[PDB]
Design a protein around this ligand. Structure first.
Ligand SMILES: CCCCCCCC/C=C/CCCCCCCC(=O)O
Length: 131
């Protein structure tokens, strides 16, 4: 997990609108979200990880242990059951609610952090650079 730790800024995004649409996020919030460039902070204290996502629009913070289910309230106000694990060197976050599921996968490639979000048929790729 150590190579993911630090402060990351968004530098590219593909298909985030499709992803938000698939989740049912309304047009007005999609507008503002398409113009926001979040900062993601990942820190560890022992076996507890904390992931903060800061922007001018909304902010989120979750703390979890790898492999242990937790309740999460997402930025779009879903209440889901979450689990984060390390899989092939990727940080894999699975959210489940109402019989549905979405995955948020983070991998390090050439020193950049690539976040892939999948729900239904929609796939979004977001690229973060280390600050
Ligand atoms: C919460 C801080 C950034 C919020 C941006 C707008 C959110 C609007 C609704 C989004 C629903 C999908 C939630 C997950 C998106 C994560 C984006 C990222 O970490 O790159």
């Amino acid at each position: 997990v150590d190579a993911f730790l630090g402060t990351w800024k968004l530098v590219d995004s593909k298909n985030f609108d499709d992803y938000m649409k698939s989740l049912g996020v309304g047009f007005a919030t999609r507008q503002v979200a398409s113009m926001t460039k979040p900062t993601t902070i990942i820190e560890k204290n022992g076996d507890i990880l904390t992931l903060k996502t800061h922007s001018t629009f909304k902010n989120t913070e979750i703390s979890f242990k790898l492999g242990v289910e937790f309740d999460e309230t997402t930025a779009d106000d879903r209440k889901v059951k979450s689990i984060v694990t390390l899989d092939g060197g990727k940080l894999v976050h699975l959210q489940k609610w109402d019989g549905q599921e979405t995955t948020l996968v983070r991998e390090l490639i050439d020193g950049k952090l690539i976040l892939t979000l999948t729900h239904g048929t929609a796939v979004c790729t977001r690229t973060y650079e280390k600050e």
